[PDB]
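Retry 2 of 3 after timeout on previous attempt. Resubmitting structure tokens to design endpoint.
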């Protein structure tokens, strides 16, 4: 229940975080049962959320469109590239408290 990337330092992906209410709701909707997570766990559950909500059907194009989903409100963008991992981390950090 974790996903990692070479674009971000490994240790950063172990950062302990407490999601604020919207982020926490999204994670719990796909089976998360806690209040505190590592970042790589947050990325896993958010990935599961994205696929469950059908926000990434075009696998070849690497754009996620989320303008009309809770995810769009969470991140503050209509769309983002799944390949820009630092940008994704930045957007997630705004929605949690770092322990
Ligand atoms: C089911 C899988 C295959 C394990 S997955 O990795 O969770 C699928 C998701 C998808 C829902 C968006 N996802 C991805 O597909 C991909 C593989 C997209 C991707 C494709 C190619 C390249 C490259 O060539 O450099 C880089 N990144 O990884 C996303 C990811 C993984 C770890 C950390 C981060 Cl920040 C993003 C990663 C992702 C993107 C966004 C978010 Cl919020 C969460 C995970």
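Retry 2 succeeded. Sequence:
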């Amino acid at each position: 229940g974790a996903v990692t990337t070479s674009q971000i330092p490994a240790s950063e992906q172990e950062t302990l975080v407490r999601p604020k209410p919207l982020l926490l709701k999204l994670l719990k909707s796909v089976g998360a049962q806690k209040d505190t997570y590592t970042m790589k766990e947050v990325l896993f559950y958010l990935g599961q959320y994205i696929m469950t909500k059908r926000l990434y059907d075009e696998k070849q194009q690497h754009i996620v469109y989320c303008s009309n989903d809770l995810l769009g409100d969470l991140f503050g963008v209509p769309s983002f590239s799944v390949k820009e991992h630092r940008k994704i981390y930045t957007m997630i950090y705004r929605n949690l408290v770092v322990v």
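Attempt log closed. The first strand starts at residue 16 and ends at 19.
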